[PDB]
Each structure stands twice: as C-alpha cells, then as structure tokens.
Amino acid sequence: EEPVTADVINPMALRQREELREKLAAAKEKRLLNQKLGKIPWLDDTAAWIERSRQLQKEKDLAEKRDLQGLTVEHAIDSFREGETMILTLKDKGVLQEEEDVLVNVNLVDKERAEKNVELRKKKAQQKPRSILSKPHSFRLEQGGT
Amino acid sequence: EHVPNSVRLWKAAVELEEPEDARIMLSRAVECCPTSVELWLALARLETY
C-alpha cells in the first residue's frame, strides 16, 4: 500500500563517503598532532663552543675519578581422567577473526571427531535437527584450574 | 655537545668550519679519539711552517 522510508544503498558512493571521512580524520589528526609537535652567542661562534666542549671534557674526566582465569577449554570437564596430566594448545582461528581464545587438546578433539563420525554412521527445542546448522562443550577457568 | 666518539660528526663539522677552528676541533677530536688518523692527517695538512 505505502512503502516505508528506504535509503538507497549506493555501493560506490559509499566508498567516496568513506574516503572523504578518512581524509577528514587524517586532517583532524594532523591538526591535533601539530599542536603536540609544534611546541619545539654560542650558536654563531666556534671558539666559544670548543671552550665549552673542553670544559665539559674536563668535567667528565673529573667525574671519572601462571594464572589463566577465563580461558575457555572446549572440552567437557568429565573428558579429563584422574591420575595423569595432558597438554592443551590453542585452537586455530583467523587473526582478524575477533573471538575469545579457547584451549584444545588434539587427541581429545580427535576422539570427539571419531565419536561424531561413529554416531553419524549409525543414526541413519523446536526443529532440533537443523538447529545445529544455524548455531560447544566448554568451561571457564578460574584462578588457574577449576 | 654529547661528546661522541664518532669521527663522522667531527668530519662533517670540520669541513664547514673556519680553518683555525677546524684544526682546533680536530685536536679536540684527537683528544677524544687518539685512533682517529684522519683527524691527525687533516691537522698535519694544516701544519703551517
């Protein structure tokens, strides 16, 4: 009946706007930084300077005489067996990918992958089967261990 | 003015200084760095009569 107000998305005019914004930001940074940067006899004769240098040389000669709280572990607490210790390493993530670092054991992940593969080879709150697609067993460390 | 052992600063200062002041600065550098044979040779180049 009546369309609601929509701003036209121009992919390449937005680039011009971004470039103008970047130029304005650079100019503002230059103006701000020049204030912090623009704040800063013996200059015309040499014999006086050499006398001062010799005096300073004489002066120098005279003076000659453990805690990892908050680090998630992407494994169930029950996965770890008493009586032995085992090593955790960081899971691979992209550098630009802004996300929390998780601690991972390669052997435990291999075991979980094998379990998932076994389950999928034998299986042949709303709409659960496709909830995994749109969207995990981790615990948070506190003052070291938990 | 920081008394550097480098000869490059002394060499740059001397080549644009007055010859008497140049040789005095060369003597000062030799006092700072006796091993600077370049400064001694330059002073000997102005050894006069």
Curated annotation (Swiss-Prot), chain A:
PTMs per UniProt: Sumoylated with SUMO2.
UniProt crosslink position (Glycyl lysine isopeptide (Lys-Gly) (interchain with G-Cter in SUMO2)): 91, 128, 135
Domain of life from the UniProt record: Eukaryota
Coiled-coil ranges (or none): 10-65
Residues recorded as bearing Phosphoserine in the entry: 138
Record's subcellular location: Nucleus
Organ and tissue specificity: Ubiquitously expressed.
Functional summary from the UniProt entry: Plays a role in mRNA splicing as a component of the U4/U6-U5 tri-snRNP, one of the building blocks of the spliceosome. May also bind to DNA.
Quaternary structure annotation from Swiss-Prot or TrEMBL: Identified in the spliceosome C complex. Component of the U4/U6-U5 tri-snRNP complex composed of the U4, U6 and U5 snRNAs and at least PRPF3, PRPF4, PRPF6, PRPF8, PRPF31, SNRNP200, TXNL4A, SNRNP40, DDX23, CD2BP2, PPIH, SNU13, EFTUD2, SART1 and USP39. Interacts with UBL5. Interacts with IVNS1ABP (via Kelch repeats).
Similarity annotation: Belongs to the SNU66/SART1 family.
Protein name listed in UniProt: U4/U6.U5 tri-snRNP-associated protein 1
Source organism per UniProt: Homo sapiens
Residues of the full protein shown: 148 to 356 of 800
UniProtKB/Swiss-Prot annotation, chain B:
Entry superkingdom: Eukaryota
Tissue spec: Widely expressed.
Post-translational changes noted in the entry: Phosphorylated by PRP4K during spliceosome assembly.
HAT repeats: 21-47
Compartment(s): Nucleus, Nucleoplasm; Nucleus speckle
Biological role stated in the UniProt entry: Involved in pre-mRNA splicing as component of the U4/U6-U5 tri-snRNP complex, one of the building blocks of the spliceosome. Enhances dihydrotestosterone-induced transactivation activity of AR, as well as dexamethasone-induced transactivation activity of NR3C1, but does not affect estrogen-induced transactivation.
Subunit structure as annotated in this protein's UniProt entry: Identified in the spliceosome B complex. Identified in the spliceosome C complex. Associates with the U5 snRNP particle. Component of the U4/U6-U5 tri-snRNP complex composed of the U4, U6 and U5 snRNAs and at least PRPF3, PRPF4, PRPF6, PRPF8, PRPF31, SNRNP200, TXNL4A, SNRNP40, DDX23, CD2BP2, PPIH, SNU13, EFTUD2, SART1 and USP39, LSm proteins LSm2-8 and Sm proteins. Interacts with ARAF. Interacts with AR and NR3C1, but not ESR1, independently of the presence of hormones. Interacts with USH1G.
Disease: Retinitis pigmentosa 60: A retinal dystrophy belonging to the group of pigmentary retinopathies. Retinitis pigmentosa is characterized by retinal pigment deposits visible on fundus examination and primary loss of rod photoreceptor cells followed by secondary loss of cone photoreceptors. Patients typically have night vision blindness and loss of midperipheral visual field. As their condition progresses, they lose their far peripheral visual field and eventually central vision as well.
Protein known as: Pre-mRNA-processing factor 6
Organism: Homo sapiens (Human)
Full-protein positions shown: 398 to 446 of 941
